[PDB]
Amino acid sequence: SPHSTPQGIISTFRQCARFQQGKDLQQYVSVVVLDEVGLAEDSPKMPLKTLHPLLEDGCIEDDPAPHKKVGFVGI
């Protein structure tokens, strides 16, 4: 939503990562689904900025790890 903050997206990605932790990533996957992304596009909070790192590795400042790379669909 226009009021969604970066922390919401970060916590969503982190939760998907916690789900992927400890499992075989060739048989299990966790996906992040964002609904109504366009609403956040030009909000003053600019949450979508976080997407670039989180899509690449799954971490903004944390060190890379396999379980942090989750799937993603934005609708």
Binding site: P2, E41, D42, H52, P53, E61
Partner: protein, 1004 residues
Amino acid sequence: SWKRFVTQKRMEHFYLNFYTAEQLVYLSTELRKQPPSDAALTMLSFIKSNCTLRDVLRASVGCGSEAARYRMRRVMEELPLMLLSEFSLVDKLRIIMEQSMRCLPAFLPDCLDLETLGHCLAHLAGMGGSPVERCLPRGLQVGQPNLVVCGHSEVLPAALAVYMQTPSQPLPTYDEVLLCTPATTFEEVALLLRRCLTLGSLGHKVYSLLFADQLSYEVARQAEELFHNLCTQQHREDYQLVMVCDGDWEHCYLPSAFSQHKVFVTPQAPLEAIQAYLAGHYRVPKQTLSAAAVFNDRLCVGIVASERAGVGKSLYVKRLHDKMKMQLNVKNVPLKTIRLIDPQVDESRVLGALLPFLDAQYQKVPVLFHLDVTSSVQTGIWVFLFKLLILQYLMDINGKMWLRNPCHLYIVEILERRTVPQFSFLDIFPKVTCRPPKEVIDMERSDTEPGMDLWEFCSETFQRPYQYLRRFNQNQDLDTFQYQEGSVEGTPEECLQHFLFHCGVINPSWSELRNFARFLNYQLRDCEASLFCNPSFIGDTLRGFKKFVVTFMIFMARDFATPSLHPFSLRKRWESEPHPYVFFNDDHTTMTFIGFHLQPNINGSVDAISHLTGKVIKRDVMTRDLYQGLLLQRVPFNVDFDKLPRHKKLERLCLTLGIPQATDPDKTYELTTDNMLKILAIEMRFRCGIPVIIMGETGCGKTRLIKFLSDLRRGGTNADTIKLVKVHGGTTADMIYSRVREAENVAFANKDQHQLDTILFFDEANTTEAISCIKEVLCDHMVDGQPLAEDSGLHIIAACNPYRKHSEEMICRLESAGLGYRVSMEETADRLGSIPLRQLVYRVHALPPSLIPLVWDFGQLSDVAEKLYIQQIVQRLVESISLDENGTRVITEVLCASQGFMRKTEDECSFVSLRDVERCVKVFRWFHEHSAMLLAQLNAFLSKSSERDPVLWSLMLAIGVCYHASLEKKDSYRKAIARFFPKPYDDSRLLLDEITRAQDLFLD
């Protein structure tokens, strides 16, 4: 009940209104201590300047009435009985609440009640010097709430004129002036109104509420209510209250409420009077030890400004600090630098940075504060400067307060963001204007118009090129000349004249001239150290060598020094210019020539030609005699590196770089002449000291080239000689500083153990405003104001994404997708000036103007390199999954065709790169793995609806997912791709059919 109690006590005690609730809690706790905190004493200073423990102790006497101790003792005796009389917890709590409002010291003996604090503050105020007696200008009435309505630019000067009426009275502070903002809380306005109307004060001060229009509706309403209420009660019948608003916003609540009071004679003063007033108040007496002594007229505040970058602001501050260390005879003079990076000034960061200095040791010691307002800052600057420089204060509601001490010097480094009044606000301040070289020659000593710094003019960097050029222009003999270290010749004017003449730029900054001089100095040093200039060792075979060296190096500098850029005025190309490079190898015996050939002409001279086109680049670089002599020395002229073997290329490269071993770390990287020139350029810049900022599309080869160079220099040693940081919009300044410091430590370690230099690389730096911090690292050679450690072996590289705009058709597709954008391009705040960011191909912010002259194009990715990278990727796939040659050919040709079609389709795709091909190959691989099972299901599924090569099938579905789906004109893509598929698969219809059958199989 507590709120009523606080309001009543605030009416009974005047000085409590100087502070808020949390500030009062802080003071109540601290003052009982021995000694109080320096913060508390600073907070009190706004009532009694230079408040000390002795002042608080003297003020405490009398306020501690014995009647208060009687009340305390009585309540301490009574409360046990009162609480025993009531049984419910809620009644006990109510009793406690009442008794706490009656006598708090009985409960909290370590804290002052509001009454004792009020008395102490009043005693402090009365111990002070003379009261402030101010007079209102003509047109403004005492006892009446006056209102002024003006243009934004006039708001601040007008308030200043109000106080100008009494130029002998001290400048005001937060007590007298409040600058309103949308975030301004009701507590601040309420305390201002209480200070104006309430009694208890000793003088007729003036109270101003500026930019009132910005106040929120709720705050303005509450302020009006409080104002009227105060006027109903026993109040000051001679109060002087002024509101100032922006005429454009006059329609809002506060300007409307007081429209009747509107005054039509707007106060104003000439710029000269404001200048003299501020200068007088800033002037520090002779007896007070202060930093100001170095400044022009003992002014404790000063501005350093320029019309463009690289003109000596930071240098001026450095020279000022040195002069202060020399003149003041003090063992040390602390220097604090503060960098303002955020577009909206964050006063809390500045306050946090300054707070460490509140300690008493600094209160009577020369200290210099340097505030750098980078180009990133766009808003909040004039308010901040008004508050700190004029109102002498900074504050957060948290309670901590900074007061500007006259024993300290404050210098602001800013670029003149002039865009309307008759003068800019900065002009009111004492200002130093730094000029570029050409203005320095033309207009010219003064202390506000600095010219050529004498330490630089006497440096090797300027002197060696200066002496060489001085002899060169007069055609004097250079064969015998030799620069003696420390020698000095000529004057600053002739040095500037020669540099500007040969520089190549018309109106250069000082940084550009420094980079030119540094380059020519480095290469002339290498020339002097070579054997061709050693004690004779040649007889006289090399007549004119230095003349040629000077001419050619003056030409070569054109590439490194000259800009490469000319709202979106930022682009130029790399292939548009020749890259003739000459290097003096560390062996002092050989030279390397790249990027050009030497051709003898009929004129008896030798000309420079392009190795590719053969066209003349520059004529008369040398005479034929020198050319023959250099050939007799076996100098590699007219070499064609493109035809040489791989190992010969590697050897020439390692020799020129100074590497001893040609250990090939990557046989796949193609060592073409262009890549070798690019490497040699980055090397030269690392060597001479010029920052490296590159501009290029993604996938053009920056990362691979840097990795190849790092590996080649590493020589197989197990060390992390390179750190790559991928910058993004979320990359803050702290992340950059931490990465730089970690890289500096790693570089020191690598240099100590393995004697290896370290590279730090920032990719997509422009994506964030923190890019301005990267400027500090590259040009200023500092980190958060702290200087970098030289000789650590750390080199920094930055890559900038290009500034491109989507086509209009593509922008239409974007604006038309779905229900359209939630915000219109006009209302957007995410914009690069006039252009919204969503219309850009890369989300990039503006470059700091100091970096603009340094950026150079890395070059576009040619079709041949694209095809070769595709071939490498397909071959890796072949090895991984056992493909044949036919499939390899088909995949390569089809991926090339897809990239070409998407590049041509400017109405649907603006961004094309090699990463997409990796993505598509990944999809192909996945389809191949499952291809066995999925096709079986397909055969079953299709049997319900009553032969395929897994490779071409997986290719079809990969193309479908990666390219076919994103497109709208799918038919053209399928038509183009079909040509490359073997028969009978060379039909767009069959591709669509197979994609559809797969989609069906998946829905089943």
